[PDB]
Amino acid sequence: LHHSEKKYAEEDQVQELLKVLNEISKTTLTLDPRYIWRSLKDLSSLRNQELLNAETLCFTVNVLYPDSSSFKKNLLKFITSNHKSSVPGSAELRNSYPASFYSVNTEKKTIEVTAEINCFMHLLVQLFLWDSKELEQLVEFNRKVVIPNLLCYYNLRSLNLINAKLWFYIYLSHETLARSSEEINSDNQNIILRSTMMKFLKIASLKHDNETKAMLINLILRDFLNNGEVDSASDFISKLEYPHTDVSSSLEARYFFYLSKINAIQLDYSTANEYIIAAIRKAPHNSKSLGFLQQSNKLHCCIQLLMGDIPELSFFHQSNMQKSLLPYYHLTKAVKLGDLKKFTSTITKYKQLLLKDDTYQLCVRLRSNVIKTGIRIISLTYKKISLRDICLKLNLDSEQTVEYMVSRAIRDGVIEAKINHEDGFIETTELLNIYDSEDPQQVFDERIKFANQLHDEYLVSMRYPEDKKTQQNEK
Amino acid sequence: TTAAPLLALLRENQDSVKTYALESINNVVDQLWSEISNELPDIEALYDDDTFSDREMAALIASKVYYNLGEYESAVKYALAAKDRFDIDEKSQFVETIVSKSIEMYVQEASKQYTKDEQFYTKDIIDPKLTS
Amino acid sequence: LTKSLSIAFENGDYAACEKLLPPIKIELIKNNLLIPDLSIQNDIYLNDLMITKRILEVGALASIQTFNFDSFENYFNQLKPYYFSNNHKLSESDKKSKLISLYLLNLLSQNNTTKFHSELQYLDKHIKNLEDDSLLSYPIKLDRWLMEGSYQKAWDLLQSGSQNISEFDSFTDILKSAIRDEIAKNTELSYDFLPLSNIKALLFFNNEKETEKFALERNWPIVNSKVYFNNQSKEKADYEDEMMHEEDQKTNIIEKAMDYAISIEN
Amino acid sequence: MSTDVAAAQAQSKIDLTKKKNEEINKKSLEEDDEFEDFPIDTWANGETIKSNAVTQTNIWEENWDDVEVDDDFTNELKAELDRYKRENQ
């Protein structure tokens, strides 16, 4: 009855572990273990949540533990203790195995392979805390317990890949506690959090684990951004090592999205634009991914107004993301029309929301782009145009001031005009017919090379999974 | 975190804070590796100047920085230049990384010079720290 | 030494502060070891922490005023760990608001807007609505007016900061030198002829002699009281052609097809 | 609720048991779903999505309007006032 329910959950987990244990006894590998490990983690996340708070505890007790079973149980005491299903028949077993962590063998200590087992019991305690949706001291206790265990000995390739996924949860739970209710010791412990993450990346370099390296790089970028330590992250992004070989496509989505943030801050709007489109196309359409997409789209609108490119109105309408994106929709219309008065209203109306996402800093730089976009519209509309007419339209000062705006603005080439100060007009330089110039030559070359690069990626990838299947016995 | 307080100590003009800077940078060299790699030539100027007895310490920093960058080749050169303070990290549970690359490098050199004559144990192409 | 720097600052002597500081640097090693370096913060390490902030705070404000911007950036960098953490428990003060204001001008007067905007995030997390902008508004307004391109609003904001002879003014003159250079970068495309009275107007000179003097130094050929931007443009273009980039900078007709050819056979 | 063309990523990616945890982690990292936070945060519900016909619910196609001000009242005033000048010419 009650023993049956905890026993069933345990038996699911055992088959998944046993599968990997067999695989790493032949020869440790990276990718074949992970696909199984990801499937197990889903089942554990769903069973911890839905089925009582003591179904983790049964497992933890059931296997041999250094001191983890007692640290697990502590967490459960606080939220109404459990004591049930820890008597023999939940502790008189070590759960079907052939002989490599089987009951008879382990107790006898003809072998002991707590190696794999310890890393999985860590995976449970992280999942279980985010399920509870709780933070306080329990976070601290999770931080303290697992980190030196993993640092008092080197890990095998399989075990390093379990412990990369624990680091993300440690980091996430620390950062949420600051956001629920800021504290003063959260600040000093953040230096500690900061130290371990970078030290980890060195540790993973020696084991030559591709998937372990990538996931830590994603963490360092995120950690700098919420601390706002962009200076240190600017040195980091020009000195990376990221592989895209074995990484999951969630990791790749995240990586590109982080770059777009730092770049936008450094006043690169052209590189930021390329990478934010990369991040979105990797990500799913699902409501699973919903919140990742909103922050991404907030940044994506912002980059375009920083360029002078001005997002589509369709883009808000085809998504059902309208209400989240409502403040960027009012900025889009404002910059396009040239109306500073419309713009100033938008940034006062929605100040609070923008400042939450910490995208308000990026938004104030847009008060400039109204003025510069306004001069580009006026140079399109009239080839030659008096200085005074600009002052009326955009609600600016003297003509001398307007002269200065254009002199600066054509250093980037935004207006693409030039001022005559003895003829008293502004004369734009565009009169297209660049197909009579040598320009398209340059362009076609680039598209051809872009095609060549997709061909190459096709070649290496097409045959590598083919090769696994043909080698593998299935006849 | 930021490496910025640490750079200022090297730049500060008193002898005493320049000695302490190398100690402070080296403690957290695995945390601030990408930061201090840009300004690794400042530390090379302190290696030249003969007013330090932490010349050996300054060289040691360089090794850890170049491993995290990606070039293992450069790290072992400057580990050998440091002389001692590299025999304490052969059994840690954290960093043995710089050491293991030395074992590799001697095998590469060993093949090349054996063919000329069996003796190569008195060549200056092989550093005495490397043999140890 | 240690308490002596405090009162030398207070008097108004700043040549005194820098002279005496290399001795106190040794004892700054002693102070740093007393705190664990912000792993936990007692009211005993609070007492220690004030000693550590104090030496550096007064050293850094004084650096500006003897025109050692180089030394200013050293002292300021040292404050950063205390500024980062333990807020609302001896980390935030009137001196802090003053000190960060001055640094933002340092990065801007060096003309790194890469750095200035990346430094601004870090501050977003700290005071900008917890001690609101009243002295930090100054460098942020200025950076904005040159991004829209209005050098009018920018010169005015500098000129009324020149009323306030304090130490903020030591970065204002750098920033008025900077407005001249930017315009001198722009004017090459903008015009081809300006009379000398017109050059004076854009470059914010009140003296026609002063305009001629900048032109020597900035390499503008004014001949018969009219400038020739087309010549200057040539010289700079010539330099850019000279350097090795050059086959695939232009991208040769031949070079394009050679690329295509080997790809289909590879 | 789908970012760009709704069908273009609905066919591009679909669920797997393997991916499902990582996706949930992505939305938690930003900290919320960020479409149900926003009504509470402002303490209102939509009326400024009722700005234009196309904004409210996309059951039309795009016009490329963004204020939707009738342009018949201004074109009528030009027409009559111009005639009178010519009449008094």
Side-chain angles (χ1 to χ4, degrees), chain A residues 218-229:
Chain A
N218 294 332
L219 295 169
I220 296 145
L221 293 157
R222 188 58 183 187
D223 206 348
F224 279 148
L225 178 52
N226 302 22
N227 300 329
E229 292 178 316

Side-chain angles (χ1 to χ4, degrees), chain A residues 383-431:
Chain A
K383 204 184 95 189
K384 309 171 157 193
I385 180 68
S386 156
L387 303 161
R388 293 175 306 254
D389 299 330
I390 292 184
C391 310
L392 305 181
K393 274 163 174 74
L394 309 185
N395 270 188
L396 304 161
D397 288 335
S398 289
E399 67 157 42
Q400 195 48 265
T401 310
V402 173
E403 297 185 273
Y404 291 133
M405 293 179 167
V406 179
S407 282
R408 181 264 182 249
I410 65 188
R411 157 180 68 199
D412 285 352
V414 182
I415 316 301
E416 193 71 301
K418 70 193 279 171
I419 320 167
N420 295 316
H421 189 231
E422 302 92 51
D423 314 334
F425 54 93
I426 313 172
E427 170 174 59
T428 178
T429 310
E430 61 208 50
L431 189 78

Side-chain angles (χ1 to χ4, degrees), chain A residues 295-307:
Chain A
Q295 197 41 253
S296 294
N297 285 1
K298 282 176 187 298
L299 170 57
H300 176 111
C301 295
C302 204
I303 297 157
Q304 283 179 95
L305 298 167
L306 283 159
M307 308 186 36

